[PDB]
């Protein structure tokens, strides 16, 4: 599984 | 919807 | 890239 | 945060 980051403030973190 | 970035090397883009 | 589904109603779709 | 499922075979879980 990869770590994905979005910005929305702070980081939205997808595992 | 958000733009997500991972890396694995280079970037991996998520929508 | 994988298609990810969550439920929140309808499907939240991650590309 | 949501629970996401993909498949690739078997399930791939995202948080
Ligand atoms: C697994 O790879 C997962 N963290 C991907 C982002 S959350 C759908
Ligand atoms: C929509 O925002 C999509 N790019 C990400 C859904 S959360 C896994
Ligand atoms: C790429 O694999 C992408 N669709 C994963 C879910 S959105 C972060
Ligand atoms: C939080 O909801 C996390 N499991 C998914 C973030 S959107 C890629």
Author numbering:
A (entry chain A), B (entry chain B), C (entry chain A), D (entry chain B): 1 to 15
Sentences from the paper on this structure:
Aβm17–35 is designed to display the side chains of Met35, Gly33, Ile31, and Gly29 on the LFAD face and the side chains of Leu34, N-methyl-Ile32, and Ala30 on the VFE face. Both molecules fold to form twisted β-hairpins, and variation between the two monomers is minimal, consisting mainly of Met35 rotamers. The tetramers formed by Aβm17–35 consist of four β-hairpins arranged around a central axis to form a β-barrel. The absence of a side chain at Gly33 facilitates the tight packing of these hydrophobic side chains in a fashion similar to that previously reported for a cylindrin comprising three β-hairpins from αB crystallin.
Aβm17–36 and Aβm17–35 are cyclic hexadecapeptides consisting of two heptapeptide β-strands (Aβ17–23 and Aβ30–36 or Aβ29–35) connected by two δ-linked ornithine turn units that promote a β-hairpin-like conformation.
